[PDB]
UniProtKB/Swiss-Prot annotation, chain A:
Changing residue 244 to D: In strain: Omicron/BA.1, Omicron/BA.2, Omicron/BA.2.12.1, Omicron/BA.4, Omicron/BA.5, Omicron/BQ.1.1. It comes from the Viruses. This is Spike glycoprotein. Variant D614G has become the most prevalent circulating sequence in the global pandemic since April 2020. The mutation is associated with higher viral loads produced in cell culture and animal models. It would not change pathogenicity nor neutralization properties vs vaccination. May be prevalent because the mutation increases virus transmission in human population. Changing residue 244 to H: In strain: Omicron/BA.2.75, Omicron/XBB.1.5, Omicron/EG.5.1. The gene is S. Pfam families: bCoV_S1_N (PF16451), bCoV_S1_RBD (PF09408), CoV_S1_C (PF19209), CoV_S2 (PF01601). Changing residue 276 to L: In strain: Omicron/BA.1. Keywords: Coiled coil, Disulfide bond, Fusion of virus membrane with host endosomal membrane, Fusion of virus membrane with host membrane, Glycoprotein, Host cell membrane, Host membrane, Host-virus interaction, Inhibition of host innate immune response by virus, Inhibition of host tetherin by virus, Lipoprotein, Membrane, Palmitate, Signal, Superantigen, Transmembrane, Transmembrane helix, Viral attachment to host cell, Viral envelope protein, Viral immunoevasion, Viral penetration into host cytoplasm, Virion, Virulence, Virus entry into host cell. The keyword Lipoprotein applies. One of its GO terms (molecular function) is receptor ligand activity. Its main location: virion.
UniProtKB/Swiss-Prot annotation, chain B:
Changing residue 127 to F: In strain: Omicron/BA.1. The chain holds residues 855 to 992 of 1273 of the full protein. This is Spike protein S2'. Residues 66-116 are annotated as: Heptad repeat 1. The gene is S. Subunit of the fusion protein that is processed upon entry into the host cell. Mediates fusion of the virion and cellular membranes by functioning as a class I viral fusion protein. Contains a viral fusion peptide that is unmasked after S2 cleavage. This cleavage can occur at the cell membrane by host TMPRSS2 or during endocytosis by host CSTL. In either case, this triggers an extensive and irreversible conformational change that leads to fusion of the viral envelope with the cellular cytoplasmic membrane, releasing viral genomic RNA into the host cell cytoplasm. It comes from the Viruses. Changing residue 2 to K: In strain: Omicron/BA.1. Residues 95-138 form a coiled coil.
Length: 996, 138, 49, 49, 149
């Protein structure tokens, strides 16, 4: 019988306080929503540790036995409660299946409406116990909910437990290795958890380290099709190799005349030779002797001779001495083995066996040509300073060991190149095409898909290679057809989420994967590590970008919420996640004709917003303190690397000073600290929210929203201008802009009434200035209301300031990464430097320290190089901000869409963390009407054109009007100018042109 | 195929062609107005008079020469087709963005054939030929 | 370690012996002879200009 | 503490304008870099001499 | 001191090559920082293990130099594009972009050459000697409002 585990069985992983934090940890845990066995008893397996529970208030459940034999034959745990105490012992006990109530000992210790919970696990010889108590109402199943179990007991007793039983409603489950994300509150209790492998949303929560995720698409994983089967393809040789004639023959050669045997067309078994005790050495080079049976070769050459026992040291690559110089040399990149033994009884004899003698790589020459000891005419004949080239070994069996004869076999291997022809003893399999498989062609191992091919190998060619050396096609050794290899299908895995705030559903995209490969592979119905079973969630759909699982395809085309790729988007709708081809927008046939114009009859003022970065957090690094932790031994090694721990400080000093330049270039545009008048008769425009609030530093109201909505060896440094100095500059800029127009940008500020300044801002966009005064209250109300909406927009969402937030988040991520890279081993024995200094002699310790120096130096260069790139990216924004302040704030830019959308009027800066915010104010025309139009008018045969503005008719009368606001005027001469007669102009019309 | 991949662009080229078409259709029927607000239609020879004022040439100069001006424009777009049709090296900037990435990937892939001082550039050789304690070093 | 040990307000649970930072750096300890919680700070360092 | 510059109450009202009555032509230098030293290095001869 | 920008372009290239040349003298853990010592004192099997440390250290030194020059070249290109723009707009024209072609209302500018750079002489009108007046946005005549053209 079984029951759902829900979220039960989490326990405190370590005796560490952590608070207000989400922490990621790997341990033996009960997986969420697993099946727990139920009981009302037998012995049970213990496995890799147990979660245990019971509903109780009778207290019939009294203890446990843990062990292997449960009684007598070995030490076994007894854990019992007797109401006086909890009791533990480990004895070779003397009790039956149930010695309990009617309703050595090398260690011992002493200390329904409710449920008891426990966890038992056993690691490093320590047996550990965790616990909880709770009230409950539900008796019929485990209480669905959460509460972390806390440690009680931790004991060095070391028993190899494989079974347990309860001593006399109760429940059992098994722990398994998993990653969990845990939530610690302000008082450092665990209060929630995520089981990362459970589902795609749980992968996403663990990927982001968050218990909630926003709407979007997130990568969590990579998908690869697994090898379904294994193949061995070998030459089908029956013959076995002639090693007795190599190793055990009578005539092992004298060393200057060394013998070579070629081996070919046979199956070997090097393990038989390697396992033999007969050899005083079995040293090997580019192959380990354990691996030799798995390999295959074009040739083996056995080189054979007898030599004096102490001289065997010359038989290696790179050696020197008379045997190497004149008798037999190995090449200095020898691939194979040297095997030798004390052949004292075999090769020595009581006459001192004079049959043996000594005198480039694999040279042999038996020549009698004399060793001359000088430039004499020795002429090949013996004499003083003229000596025969061979000398005899005095091999008597009574010799001391270094003077006895030893036999030597050298095995030199020629690899698979041409068709392999000496081979290990391996079993060949059948060949299988089109599947993802492991394969082994003559010891050439790999994983992939095998198919037919059209590759015309020339008869000597055995396999093809790609640009990366990787084997691209193979001839099968048993049937000479050419097979293509191809790598098994793979891609990035991404989770589409509506926002956990909004829904729990998800869809999964297998990027670039064909759906036929997916739902019976690493996704579902086969070997499915972490990318767990749901072969369909309801629908499986092939997009251009990859296979998409669990989303509903739609034939409509909406706007895009979650973009997938190749014009596909997804969103959550009437409910399910849908997927569709996106629409670029509403289609609009513009109402064109050769004679019709639309003129706006009304406008809106609009206040937009634009946010720009201006400076990173400044930093400098004491690279000796960071790399070496103030250890003297490490500091002395770090001298050998020269100037690196100085050009790093020089680079970061360049970054640091440039931040104060960026801030000064953006804000210090103004020579004097202008201040606002006491009166506020700015024609009804209400700046109270953007001017300083003196009751606040003296920031504006909107600046106080912006400063709230954004929120070792490594030393941070302060900015030069303080946040109160930046607020003085944004105040001075704003006070100049209000009281004096652009004039404070061209030397001395000239005062002008604000309503007249706006009349000139209108006069810059081609709207005739009377249009402002005649609409002055309306315009002031539109502006005041628009400033009001900025407060609500900035109040509405945390996503409003994402640009400035990304300067903060990247600096924190970079520094945290640079700190966490202290803990990495880089292949050294430990990442804690004091281990290496304490556990090892200095000669070994240096090599380990040098890996940590190398890893930390490569980490620190990696950090500094990203700060250079990231600072260059911020400087492009600082130059843009200084430009927008020069043209928009200090002026009125005519550059289309530079200072906000619409025709530009003015803008106001407000300070913010690491950046600036501009409130660009723009005119937008808003209520158009169609009119008939003609490019000219003919009066007395003279063709008239308007001086400024355009001719229009309401269908009966003709007027001229300005291009951006309907205001019809009678066509007097003074609105117009003549040029020539009617006839050259297209579309000219007849009207009166009036003379004043 | 060595763990390298190429992802598709979000906007497919038949979507890009609808944006460049819309920008062009706005620019013909409505001048600059569709940047400043909702598009306002105007006759094209009347848009060109505003463009002439925008360079300080008086608008009567257009109408007094409209047939000539149209022919000069049409002729230039003819020469554009012959130039682009003729000279494949004209797109040298874009073609370098293609070529530079091809060399970047080819270098990254070819580096898998380097030894860096190991016994072999091919990882499965080492794993076939050597036992663990030595294979780690390589 | 090394640092300026200080008296602190931290509220460790009975089984917890020491505290860690957001970046996993050890930064508070229970004194094993008097079960109040201390706060650990590295000894001061800085560039000399 | 650095000074950002002299403070200035602009003499604003809803009915006062200031207009200039003279001018200066002024000539201002601006300096921009355009190119580095064109440099080349033999990576065989530097590393291996 | 006006030319501090151009002189700093000279100084950074001088410091970069000095740093690259100094690093030839660093051991990086080899028995000597002079390659012919290794080749004259040691036989090849030993020598290659020492030489490989110099090759590694000198190569990491050289990649560090080339990467900082790639970044500095892009940082100069941003200035070359700005100078090319100021020459097209300020010299070949009269820019209305406020504070672009020197402070004040821009009239014209002249180029002068300088080693590794360019110097612009921006000529500008700056108003002076201002007087207060009373002002009003419009004037009534015969009950109709008037505004200045
Ligand atoms: C070919 O012949 C030459 C002699 O003419 C051989 O030279 C010997 O090479 C070894 C190198 O290990 C030296 O120690 C000897 O001193 C050389 N001999 C003389 C007389 O100088 C050469 O090794 C031969 N090569 C082959 C492959 O057989
Ligand atoms: C121009 O648009 C504005 C709104 O942006 C119009 O003002 C509104 O007019 C209606 C009556 O027609 C009132 O109910 C609203 O309270 C007005 N709003 C404001 C902010 O005052 C204005 O009437 C339009 N002008 C013309 C000539 O149609
Ligand atoms: C300028 O606008 C602000 C709001 O943006 C006005 O301040 C509000 O005024 C009323 C009436 O005195 C108070 O009830 C509110 O509490 C004020 N709001 C805040 C947030 O303080 C201000 O009165 C306007 N002033 C002028 C001259 O128009
Ligand atoms: C075109 O505009 C003219 C002038 O605004 C309009 O003519 C006026 O029409 C009203 C009645 O709607 C008469 O009371 C006025 O006496 C007319 N004035 C003049 C100068 O004729 C005319 O109605 C408009 N036509 C259309 C088709 O809208
Ligand atoms: C504008 O009005 C004039 C008359 O005032 C029109 O000119 C006449 O057009 C007819 C038809 O082409 C000719 O037969 C007459 O000889 C013309 N008379 C004169 C005095 O030129 C003219 O066609 C009208 N224009 C438009 C565009 O309708
Ligand atoms: C202005 O220059 C254009 C050429 O750029 C001249 O246009 C040509 O004029 C001749 C007659 O002189 C016609 O045969 C051609 O067909 C015209 N070319 C085109 C493209 O139409 C124009 O005549 C010149 N105008 C003046 C006043 O000199
Ligand atoms: C396993 O658990 C699920 C609920 O999570 C349940 O439907 C299923 O029947 C259980 N299977 C067994 C064999 O207990
Ligand atoms: C409980 O066990 C202890 C020894 O562990 C023993 O002294 C005590 O008498 C027991 N209590 C009862 C009620 O039997
Ligand atoms: C007692 O322990 C020793 C080892 O310490 C072991 O040899 C012996 O068999 C044990 N006897 C019992 C009864 O467990
Ligand atoms: C556990 O098993 C090992 C052999 O696998 C044995 O050497 C050891 O003594 C056992 N320890 C205990 C306490 O049972
Ligand atoms: C945290 O502990 C304090 C006492 O140390 C207590 O006042 C407070 O209510 C606790 N808060 C939570 C969220 O447990
Ligand atoms: C060599 O001979 C001995 C017996 O003299 C035998 O044990 C050994 O296996 C033989 N080895 C080979 C390779 O024949
Ligand atoms: C060996 O290969 C040949 C050629 O394909 C085949 O005819 C023969 O049956 C094979 N023999 C064995 C024992 O595999
Ligand atoms: C989820 O977001 C929507 C707005 O997109 C909001 O209305 C809703 O209240 C949010 N869900 C929760 C649990 O508050
Ligand atoms: C996916 O694979 C099947 C064969 O398994 C093939 O018929 C289909 O055309 C493929 N589709 C794509 C888009 O690759
Ligand atoms: C969507 O279009 C396909 C053909 O392109 C069709 O098979 C499908 O039935 C359509 N769906 C609906 C709801 O009409
Ligand atoms: C202008 O007229 C056309 C029909 O001629 C109509 O489609 C369009 O909506 C009209 N525009 C306005 C603003 O009334
Ligand atoms: C406008 O277009 C119509 C139809 O194409 C044509 O009859 C008329 O002559 C044209 N008028 C002008 C001024 O181009
Ligand atoms: C240690 O002993 C002293 C008395 O000698 C006592 O005051 C103190 O509370 C004890 N601390 C602990 C943790 O037992
Ligand atoms: C303008 O200033 C100059 C000196 O810069 C002076 O000589 C000249 O007389 C002044 N002109 C007027 C009209 O005040
Ligand atoms: C204008 O008059 C005010 C006093 O009303 C005075 O403070 C200010 O300095 C005068 N400005 C000029 C340009 O004379």
């Amino acid at each position: 019988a079984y029951t759902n585990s829900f979220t039960r069985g989490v326990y405190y992983p370590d005796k560490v306080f952590r608070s207000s934090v989400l922490h990621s940890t790997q341990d033996l845990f009960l997986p969420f929503f697993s099946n727990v066995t139920w009981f009302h008893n037998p012995v049970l397996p213990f496995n890799d540790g147990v979660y245990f529970a019971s509903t109780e208030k009778s207290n019939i459940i009294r203890g446990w036995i843990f062990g292997t034999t449960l009684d007598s034959k070995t030490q076994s745990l007894l854990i019992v409660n007797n109401a006086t105490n909890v009791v533990i012992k480990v004895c070779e006990f003397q009790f039956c299946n149930d010695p309990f109530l009617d309703v050595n000992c090398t260690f011992e210790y002493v200390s329904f409406k409710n449920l008891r919970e426990f966890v038992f696990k056993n690691i490093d010889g320590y047996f550990k116990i965790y616990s909880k108590h709770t009230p409950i109402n539900l008796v019929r199943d485990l209480p669905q909910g959460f509460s972390a179990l806390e440690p009680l007991v931790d004991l060095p007793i070391g028993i190899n437990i494989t079974r347990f039983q309860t001593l006399l409603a109760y429940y059992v489950g098994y722990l398994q290795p998993r990653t969990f994300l845990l939530k610690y509150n302000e008082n450092g209790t665990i209060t929630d958890a995520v089981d990362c492998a459970l589902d795609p949303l749980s992968e996403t929560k663990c990927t982001l380290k968050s218990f909630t995720v926003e709407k979007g698409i997130y990568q969590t994983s990579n998908f690869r099709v697994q090898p379904t089967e294994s193949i061995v393809r070998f030459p089908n040789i029956t013959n076995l190799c002639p090693f007795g004639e190599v190793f055990n023959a009578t005539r092992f050669a004298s060393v200057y005349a060394w013998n070579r045997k070629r081996i070919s067309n046979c199956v070997a078994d090097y393990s038989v030779l390697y396992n033999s005790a007969s050899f005083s050495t079995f040293k090997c080079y580019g192959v380990s002797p354990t691996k030799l049976n798995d390999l295959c070769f074009t040739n083996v050459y056995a080189d054979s001779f007898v030599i004096r026992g102490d001289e065997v040291r010359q038989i290696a690559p790179g050696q020197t001495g008379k045997i190497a110089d004149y008798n037999y040399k190995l090449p200095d990149d020898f691939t194979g083995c040297v095997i030798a033994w004390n052949s004292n009884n075999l090769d020595s004899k009581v006459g001192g066996n004079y049959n043996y003698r000594y005198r480039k790589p694999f040279e042999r020459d038996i020549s009698t040509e004399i060793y001359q000891a000088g430039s004499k005419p020795c002429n090949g004949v013996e004499g003083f300073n003229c000596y025969f080239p061979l000398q005899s070994y005095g091999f008597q069996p009574t010799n001391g060991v270094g003077y006895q004869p030893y036999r030597v076999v050298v095995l030199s291997f020629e690899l698979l190149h041409a068709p392999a022809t000496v081979c290990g003893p391996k079993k060949s399999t059948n060949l299988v095409k089109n599947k993802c498989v492991n394969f082994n062609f003559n010891g050439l191992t790999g994983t992939g898909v095998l198919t037919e091919s059209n590759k015309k190998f020339l008869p000597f060619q055995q396999f093809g290679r790609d640009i990366a050396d990787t084997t691209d096609a193979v001839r099968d050794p048993q049937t000479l057809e050419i097979l293509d290899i191809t790598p098994c299908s793979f891609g990035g895995v991404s989770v589409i989420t509506p926002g956990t705030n909004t829904s729990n559903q998800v869809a999964v995209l297998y990027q670039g994967v064909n759906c036929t490969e997916v739902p019976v592979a690493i996704h579902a119905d086969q070997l499915t590590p972490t990318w767990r079973v749901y072969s369909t969630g309801s629908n499986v759909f092939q997009t251009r970008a990859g296979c998409l699982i669990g989303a509903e395809h739609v034939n409509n085309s909406y706007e895009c919420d979650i973009p997938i790729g190749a014009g596909i988007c997804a969103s959550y709708q009437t409910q399910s996640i849908i997927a569709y081809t996106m629409s670029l927008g509403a289609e609009n046939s513009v109402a064109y004709s050769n004679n019709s114009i639309a003129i706006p009859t009304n406008f809106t003022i609009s206040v937009t917003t634009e946010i720009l970065p201006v400076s990173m957090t400044k930093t400098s690094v004491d690279c000796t303190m960071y790399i070496c932790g103030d250890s003297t031994e490490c500091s002395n090694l770090l001298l050998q690397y020269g100037s690196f721990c100085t050009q790093l400080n020089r680079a970061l000093t360049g970054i640091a000073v440039e931040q104060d330049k960026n801030t000064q270039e953006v804000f210090a545009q103004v020579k004097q600290i202008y201040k606002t008048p006491p009166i506020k008769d700015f024609g009804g425009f209400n700046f109270s929210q953007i001017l300083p609030d003196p009751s606040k530093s003296k920031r504006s109201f909107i600046e106080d929203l912006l400063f709230n909505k954004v929120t070792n060896g490594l030393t941070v440094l302060p900015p030069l201008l303080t946040d109160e100095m930046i607020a003085q500059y944004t105040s001075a800029l704003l006070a100049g802009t209000i009281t004096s127009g652009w004039t404070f940008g061209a030397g001395a500020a000239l005062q002008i009434p604000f309503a007249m300044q706006m009349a000139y801002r209108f006069n810059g966009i081609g709207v005739t200035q009377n249009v402002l005064y005649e609409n002055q209250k309306l315009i002031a109300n539109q502006f005041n209301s628009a400033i009001g909406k900025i407060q609500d927009s900035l109040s509405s969402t945390a996503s409003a300031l994402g640009k400035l937030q990304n300067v903060v988040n990247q600096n924190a991520q970079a520094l945290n990464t640079l700190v966490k890279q202290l803990s990495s081993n880089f292949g050294a024995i430990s990442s804690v430097l004091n281990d290496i200094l304490s556990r090892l002699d200095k000669v070994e310790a240096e090599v380990q320290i040098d890996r940590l120096i190398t890893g930390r130096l490569q980490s620190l260069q990696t950090y500094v190089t990203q700060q250079l790139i990231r600072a260059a990216e911020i400087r492009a924004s600082a130059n843009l901000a200084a430009t927008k302040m020069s043209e928009c704030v200090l002026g009125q830019s005519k550059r289309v869409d530079f200072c906000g959308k619409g025709y530009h009027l003015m803008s106001f800066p407000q300070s913010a963390p690491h950046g600036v915010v501009f409130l660009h104010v723009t005119y937008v025309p808003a209520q158009e009407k169609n009119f008939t139009t003609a490019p000219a008018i003919c009066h007395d045969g003279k063709a008239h054109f308007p001086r400024e503005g355009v001719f229009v008719s309401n269908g009966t009368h003709w007027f001229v009007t300005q291009r951006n606001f309907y205001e019809p005027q009678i066509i007097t001469t003074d609105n117009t100018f003549v040029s020539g007669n009617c006839d050259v102009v297209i579309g000219i019309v007849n009207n009166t042109v009036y003379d004043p | 195929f060595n763990g390298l991949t190429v992802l598709p662009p979000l906007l497919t080229d038949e979507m890009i062609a609808q944006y460049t078409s819309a920008l062009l259709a706005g620019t013909i029927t409505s001048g600059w107005t569709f940047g400043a607000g909702a598009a306002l239609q105007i006759p094209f020879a009347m848009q060109m008079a505003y463009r002439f004022n925008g360079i300080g040439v008086t608008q009567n100069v257009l109408y007094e020469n409209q047939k000539l001006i149209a022919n000069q424009f049409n002729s230039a777009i003819g020469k554009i087709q012959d130039s682009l049709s003729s000279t494949a090296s004209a797109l040298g900037k874009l073609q370098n963005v293609v070529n530079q990435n091809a060399q970047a990937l080819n270098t990254l892939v070819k580096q898998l054939s380097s030894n860096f001082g190991a016994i072999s550039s091919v990882l499965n050789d080492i794993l076939s030929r050597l036992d663990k304690v030595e294979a780690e070093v390589q």
